A paper describes a structure:
Acetylcholine-binding proteins (AChBP) have been described in several gastropods and, more recently, also in an annelid. They are homo-pentamers and water soluble homologues of the extracellular, pentameric ligand-binding domain (LBD) of the membrane-bound nicotinic acetylcholine receptors (nAChR) that belong to the Cys-loop receptor superfamily. In AChBP, the pentameric quaternary structure and the overall subunit features of nAChR-LBD are fully conserved; this also includes the typical pocket-like active site at the five inter-subunit interfaces, with several strictly conserved aromatic residues for ligand binding, and a C-loop for controlled access to the active site. We retrieved full-length sequences of two distinct subunits (termed BgAChBP1 and BgAChBP2), encompassing 205 amino acids plus signal peptide and sharing 52% sequence identity. The resulting cryo-EM structure is a regular pentagonal dodecahedron ∼22 nm in diameter and assembled from twelve ring-like pentamers; each pentamer measures 7–8 nm in height and width and comprises a central channel that is ∼2 nm in diameter.
Recombinant BgAChBP1 formed small particles that we interpreted as pentamers, and much larger particles that are indistinguishable from the native rosette-like protein. We docked twelve copies of the homology-modeled BgAChBP1 pentamer into the 6-Å cryo-EM structure. The correlation coefficient of the fitting was 0.89 as deduced from matching the cryo-EM structure and a density map that was simulated from the molecular model at 6 Å resolution. In addition, BgAChBP1 shows an unprecedented opportunity for a third disulfide bridge, C16↔C64, connecting loops L1 and L3. This bridge is lacking in all other studied members of the Cys-loop receptor superfamily, and it is also absent in BgAChBP2. The potential attachment site in BgAChBP1 for N-linked glycans, N176, is localized next to the C-terminus. The trigonal ring encompasses six different structural elements, each present as three copies: (i) Helix α1 close to the N-terminus of each subunit; (ii) disulfide bridge C16↔C64 that is specific for BgAChBP1 and tethers the C-terminal end of helix α1 to loop L3 of the same subunit; (iii) salt bridge R2↔D26 attaching the N-terminal end of helix α1 to loop L1 of a neighbored subunit from the same pentamer. These specific reinforcements of the N-terminal region of the BgAChBP1 subunit might be required for withstanding the stretching forces inflicted by the other three elements that form the inter-pentamer bridges: (iv) salt bridge D25↔R63 connecting loops L1 and L3 of two subunits from adjacent pentamers; (v) salt bridge R3↔E70 joining the N-terminal end of helix α1 and loop L3 from two subunits of adjacent pentamers; (vi) a central hydrophobic cluster of three F71 residues delivered from three different pentamers. Recombinant BgAChBP1 is able to form a homo-oligomeric dodecahedron, indicating that such a structure also exists within the animal.
Residue numbers in the entry:
A (entry chain A), B (entry chain A), C (entry chain A), D (entry chain E), E (entry chain E), F (entry chain B), ...: 1 to 205
């Protein structure tokens, strides 16, 4: 490949951090979260579980060190997700372990910015009843850091929900996809925790 | 750069997989999809095509092998998208080939998680008529794997649509951006296919 | 690690580009944008500022060169965001500098596709008043390239907003999260600029 | 076994690279991709998922060092895939984690060329509807590096799709199998990402 | 040509690195970035896109090995950009793929320093409105590694913006060109990402 | 992207100036300054500090050189502010370091004209007392080059203050926003220094 | 064809050099450059871009080896440009990627001399204003190696500009076409770079 | 002429071999031989000599080196036979030195292939007696390398004898022209020598 | 398919030649050229460019080897144009790169004869003025090998121009379509070059 690029990955991977938040100063890490709802694959009336094929856009900035002076070189490199720390975002009410559709690869930038987009199929609790009716049905699932409080991780969203990718001839039509950010509390801890509640309204076409 | 990081990329890239889904056991790959609608650049009344500047958040987990024992080292590395497998998510009704705004870089994590966020301008079919009226106009585009059925790839969404990034003084105001996941069928195949339908309601401000 | 992977990162990073848009021919770069609203952490009545914990899914394609003939090898690599060029997407009305929750890692693919997902906490202007009422309150923030016009960068969104990740017991319930793409103009320049307006309607549960 | 062969594997494995792309100079890694569609095992109308039994031919060249002077000796050796870096190629819309039919073994050549062919069963989103009709049904799935952009990994194909291996008495007849290479962009990143879209048209015989 | 020079290129190109960051030790790669704004070619009111003809100065240091003892010989050689790794710097909000005005050639120095300057035309989102007014209009575009976080790639700037080259009789007068460096975060990743925001204030003369 | 645009940026950035005022002949650089007062976020009675969310329109002309003959090509390009020289305009009485809301991107034009518009939150000294009264309260802050005298930098304003963007439901109503240009002297130096005094009269609505 | 000719091409192509400057001794490579201005196709007043249909005469000598003793045989052969190294000559200010009118074929001679003449349409920056006036308008574009300094590549011209081929009934009359050679410097490098500035004065007939 | 062609001849002639067989590896040189019998000019009964006007097609491949990278250029050049090595093919039983009708020019090809066709008048021993009879008369002459054994030079023939060119109103009619290849031995040497025996049967018309 | 046919393609493609002119003996390659003018799609008065939809009939004979004895089998096979060498015929004055309407497939025959017919849209320089007049307008474009001289490639035509296919209700009526063969010279080279000048006289009906 390119030798210049080669040095970059090795320096960051070999020299530049183990799993530890590199930021010493006054910063929580914000992670932008967006959902591209690909398809609502299936509904289970007996189980009251619904399946979503989604990919999640995750963006964050990590502190990286510039060592060897940056010359005009390879700006973004791609690396396996395993190589770097990723956020704990989880669906609060998944019925089953989510499965991963896509390769675990993340693009990293010199500024430290990282973009990771997994594709996933998730089963979440939701009653399908009245899917056939014109009114349709509503489901909600909340995503957010399991462990991190708002102080440690701040979640942000650019927009409501990305319908564009949605499969044209999906079994179910999308009434409205929303991603509203909310902060709430748990009995364990005094700290506020932030999650993104994805509320999807859909019916069978 | 850092030698420790250096070894990481090379081991994953040189030793650890060619384009092949690394997961042998009972897992489909789920890809989370989210849309950050940046701007609705233009509307064409004669053509009935509309232009969106979007970035797509894609997340997936790939199986990677740990070889050399992981010491505290570079957790995420960045690499070009070309280096690793990426999902086939496509807009079902694009008028033209989408163009890429941003560098193709993806951040990868040790767990195998990958985050890839492309920025794109897409032209899709949509009638602009009555954009001026208070009611505004509605458009929908579905994104989803072209080839993969729900069994192979499951799509998931965290939330509806990310408005926050939306340009303040865009030509068109955003009534509501939604990303609803749906599964549907095609005559070619008995399998369900999942797509995320992005339904955007907008009018000129 | 894997030697095969090793060569990949170095070739792309060391040999294959400095910060410069590699695409000579007729292409703007499109960046798909999606928001996964994790949580609405806090509201400040006196300040009229609201905090969102979000992650942003960003996807783009960069032109990379294949040098050493691609054998079946490591498809995605992960690299720090600093290594590669990332888009300038910014919140138009942030009160404060956004902080980064997650590591800056991006997965890159051989096709050149990059996925970067940062996690972020952002403070934006928004009046909280009447959060308690049933009607709730509405806020909007626009994200989009600061410098780039629609010609340089096109933004696209798959869906409205990803609620699924939203934290279950967040302080505030999500009425609806939307990401509508819009294009608008500024007095500085004749060119259209595209942004994604994230409109979030929420109330306290 | 043969002592001469013995030295070869150990030298390459023990001495000659960890996961790191070994190529410093001006080369992206190209990976040739071909599909041998073995069978379309099943179609699921409710799920809209289809199952393919495929093996994927992956070829790439890695840089290896000649140390001990090459005498006429064992030209190709076989080794477990785990030993060396493999590409991240993933199906964009797999419903589930792909499972692996065959042993993970790859033949390597002195020139550095590697041939790895996994056998896989993949579930992908696709509507089966109208499978019985004469017209049949069409499905598409895209394979490509998740993380790597076109700059890092370039994908190439020799031909359209390999029908010859196709099971004679499969439940479904093959109208046409195609593998067209395409490059596209994502909102995350400005870089182009390349994927191979496998479009399969089939009907029940 | 000169035989002495001849050996130099071949040794570096043939022997001395594939795409891999060559730096093992504690160094991120810093890439200096500067903009020479040549001209603001056009403004599009309907599209809200603006066109800039720019060349980008990119400088970085790669680790090269001295083999054959350096005698007084050819100090810099020139080579095609394809030969060596280049950074992923991309415009965050380009509407279209940037096109390349100049040959892709980069001068390399013995110390390892590389200077690459592409000339480019870029279309970026920006509202032209009020270009005629005395106040003029402001546009901003951010450039930075797509994939690389601040840890992998550090971006630096010598000065604000180079007006000197600016075309004398350009359609639009330059009020002020600024390049301020900033670091920000994305929802995907905890790491900080650094970008250079080019803010250009211009009006029609 | 577009190759034509590509050459432009590289030529200006790589070849066409480091931080140095390119103008040899009889010209001071004039920088037009305008304020768009977005919002008066907060008032602190104990501290006597007030917060303004503003964006500053800055325009200047830099001398650029035309090299490769300008063909009809990309007229404006966008670049990070870091790439080019920007003026030192500072608020004389900021209590704290101003924070930057927007990406640092500036549009540059062929004529050399540059438009840069940062968005900022600034804390300045000002007594809030009697904000509730009908009379309201007055505050003033002066912006101007710290180092540059009137001879080096001349500041100009098109109009008084831009209220239009002002947030409709801001905590404080705007009685009158004024930007009067004035020149004054300091004990350090015999030269006149020019600043723009922003006098804002506001009260709580 | 002729067997004698057959051996010639194969020997030079198969045996006699890869991309590397074959000249070891004290020689820079001189490339003669001449322009045959075919037509000025169009002028764009809004864009300030002008289109030229040109063919470029390029001549250089490469070192080739005589192997099989040269008998009276085929003196020049023709081959695709891809087969052999060609110079990087580029227009400094092209707005867009130049397009190629003619086949890429170059005649090579036994002495090593090569003649390559591409036909091209180029868009370059140039103000058309006052094209109608008797005075007409002047435009200039500079061509020259992007990477190569005067030491590596020396450019030479036989004459001013070739009008003879100029289309008789072109939209624009040619006042004077000039090709003056000049050497100039760039901030990147201490070395002199040589370019041919084509200054064309034309008006509408 | 063409400069490109010019370099070719000089490189091959000046740099690329003196009379020496350039092929080091396991190859004899094969020379294809064909005869185009133009005319049987005269018969001498007392002398028993017959005159043939023939041209001989000779083809061989020489190893040439490619130096300066082959661009699309002049594919075959022509050169005097003196310039390159030619085979020793001689008529075994010529009564007199053969005379040369045509210019000694040979076409050479890039692959190294050379085609040389001399035109010659040869006097060979042959009894004319019974030329008038219906049976006619037969003559044979053998051509082949004088010095070279079959190991050094291998002779090949495509076909029997080329009558087409034969002069229509020649004094003698051609019954049959044959060129059979044969290998035979001589007392001097143990090696086999190969010759082409031209057996011509002709009578007076 | 047919096994007999199968062997044929593989033998010719796999065994029987790489890009090299297979003919060693005294033959230039003649390529017959014919034009079937399908339609004159458009005329551009400002640009002085005209668009032709044409298909080009190209015929040539290549030397192929018969290996396995030809039995009565598949006489012509079809193959992609990429598989075999095609001539460099180019339009001398195309304004833009020609685009290809039809699949690149060529029929090959056992004798070695190949027939390739591309469909193309070409933009060429031509003044449209007086298209409306009865006299109409004349345009000419020359097609011919770019690199090859008359010695290497000889062009032949069967007839003047094929009107029969011409679209009945085309915007422009065809006065006369002619294809005259001519040979001419260029300053680069002493050799004659042959081209077919297509002179089309047309007017609006």
């Amino acid at each position: 490949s390119r030798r210049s690029r080669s040095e970059i990955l090795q320096d960051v991977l070999s020299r530049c951090s183990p799993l530890n938040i590199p930021i010493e100063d006054d910063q929580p890490v914000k992670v932008s979260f967006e959902y591209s709802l690909q398809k609502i694959f299936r509904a289970d009336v007996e189980n009251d579980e619904v399946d979503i094929g989604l990919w999640t856009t995750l963006v964050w900035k990590d502190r990286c060190l510039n060592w060897f002076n940056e010359f005009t070189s390879f700006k973004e490199l791609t690396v396996p997700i395993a190589e770097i720390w990723t956020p704990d975002i989880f669906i609060f009410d998944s019925v089953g372990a989510p499965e991963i559709f896509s390769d675990k690869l993340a693009r990293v930038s010199q500024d430290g910015t990282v973009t990771y987009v997994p594709q996933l199929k998730v089963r979440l609790s939701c009653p399908l009843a009245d899917l056939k009716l014109e009114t349709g049905v509503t489901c909600s699932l909340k995503s957010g850091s399991w462990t991190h409080s708002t102080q440690e991780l701040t979640l942000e969203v650019n927009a409501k929900v990305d319908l564009g990718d949605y499969a044209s001839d999906t079994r179910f039509q999308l009434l409205n996809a929303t991603q509203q950010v909310n902060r709430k509390q748990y009995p364990c801890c005094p700290e506020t925790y932030e999650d993104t509640t994805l509320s999807f309204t859909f019916r069978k076409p």
